[PDB]
C-alpha cells in the first residue's frame with residue numbers, strides 16, 4: 001500500500017523528475033510498479049545498472065532472463081520486455097538503448113525511450129549513459145522530448161546529477 005512513493009525528486013518537466021540516488025536503494029524504498037533496467041539484447045546483466053539490479057535479486061533476475069531468451073530469442077536494440085521486478089518492483093522493464101562503445105546508432109535512443117510510454121510511472125536510469133557510452137546530457141534531452149508518462153530518474157553520481165540539472169535550463 002505505499003507503492004510509487006517517490007520522494008525528494010526535482011521536477012524538470014511536467015512528467016520528468018530527477019534525483020541524486022542509487023537506483024537499487026531507491027527501488028527498495030519507493031516500491032515502484034516498474035523499475036527500468038539498462039539491458040542488452042541478450043539480457044546478460046553484467047555491469048553498471050544491470051549488474052547492480054541483478055545482484056540485488058541474488059541472481060534471480062539473470063536466471064529468469066536466460067529462460068526468457070531461450071524461449072523468445074534476443075531483443076532488438078531499441079526494444080524492451082517486461083519481466084518480474086523481484087525484490088525491487090512489481091515489474092522490471094528491460095530496455096535496450098544503443099551502446100555507443102559498440103558503435104550502435106545513437107538515433108535508436110529515441111525508440112528505446114518510447115518503451116517508457118507504455119507505463120504510467122517508472123523508476124529509471126538514463127538510457128545509453130554510463131557503460132553504454134552516450135553523452136548523459138543527450139540521453140536526458142531525448143528522455144524529455146520522448147517520454148510522456150511519469151519518469152523518475154535516479155542518477156548515482158552527485159557530480160553528474162549537478163551537470164545534468166545545471167545544464168538542462
Ligand SMILES: O=C(O)[C@@H]1CCC[C@@H]1c1cccc2[nH]ncc12
Nearest residue numbers: 039040041042043044046099102
Ligand atoms: O560481449 C559483450 O559485450 C557481452 C558479453 C556477453 C555477450 C554480450 C554481448 C555480445 C554481443 C553483442 C552485445 N551487445 N550488448 C551486449 C553484447
